[PDB]
Design a protein around this ligand. Structure first.
Ligand code: LMN
Ligand code: PTY
Lengths: 75, 85
């Protein structure tokens, strides 16, 4: 299965070649920044997944608190 | 052997457990309906909670003014008169 790095690195390479094509350049003009983009995409995707997990748990805590506060009107 | 004696059990391996499929279907229905009820309850929450000002973060002044009511410019006139003794 995709492990958030086979997608992040692919998106990094894709955006590197995408920006490379918008300047009417050969797709693999500078492969060193292609590797840099792969690494950056992998790192950003991993950070996004971790932040999503943290954000979901914090949101669950906030919803629990809000529900507890709203329940107090009945009791 | 011959082709069909192997293609038969090949297809049989390819096909899945129906008992697992039925169990997963009834399960998925159960938790999906429970979560549906949960989301329906969640959408019922008003924008303004019942407490609101009761919350400690929404006062910010009941525990700030008492430590300020001693500075000059906020004192009751009858505070400096009898403070000498
Ligand atoms: C933009 C286009 C997106 C196109 C891709 C779509 C394809 C779908 C796959 C997207 C994908 C990555 C997102 C990539 C985004 C691209 C980067 C964007 C910027 C580019 C630069 C998220 O997909 C999964 O992520 C899960 C995250 O929890 C979520 O599950 C829900 O979460 C709960 C919430 O709290 C919910 O409560 C709950 O119901 C679900 O459990 C779901 O989002 C989903 O199942 C792939 O899964 C990846 O994330 C995790 C999951 O395991 C894996 O790493 C984990 O890390 C530890 C956790 O810290 C774990 O401990 C560890 O075990 C694990 O290793 C990865 O290895 C990989 O599998
Ligand atoms: C969202 C999911 C899908 C997207 C996934 C994205 C994947 C992660 C990103 C991958 C990026 C890979 C790019 C490859 C690395 C290239 C690095 C080259 C940097 C560089 O050459 O330095 C300068 C280029 O300017 C620069 O490059 C710096 C300016 C860059 C602008 C970035 C602005 C960030 C702040 C705003 C973020 C967006 C906010 C939106 C709300 C010099 O350039 P030169 O030497 O060629 O010549 C001068 C031309 N001036």
């Amino acid at each position: 299965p995709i492990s958030a790095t086979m997608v992040g690195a692919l998106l990094g390479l894709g955006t590197q070649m995408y920006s490379n094509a918008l300047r009417k350049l050969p797709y693999m003009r500078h492969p060193w920044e292609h590797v840099v983009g792969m690494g950056l995409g992998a790192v950003f995707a991993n950070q996004l997944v971790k932040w999503d997990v943290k954000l979901k748990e914090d949101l669950d805590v906030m919803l629990a608190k809000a529900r507890a506060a709203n329940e107090r009107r009945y009791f | 052997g011959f082709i069909m004696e192997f293609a038969e059990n090949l297809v049989l391996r390819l096909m899945e457990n129906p008992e697992e499929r039925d169990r997963k279907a009834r399960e998925h229905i159960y938790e999906m309906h429970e979560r549906c009820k949960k989301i329906k309850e969640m959408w019922a929450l008003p924008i303004r909670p019942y407490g609101f000002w009761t919350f400690e973060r929404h006062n910010a002044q009941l525990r700030w003014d008492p430590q300020i009511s001693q500075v000059a410019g906020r004192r009751d006139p009858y505070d400096d008169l009898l403070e000498d003794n």
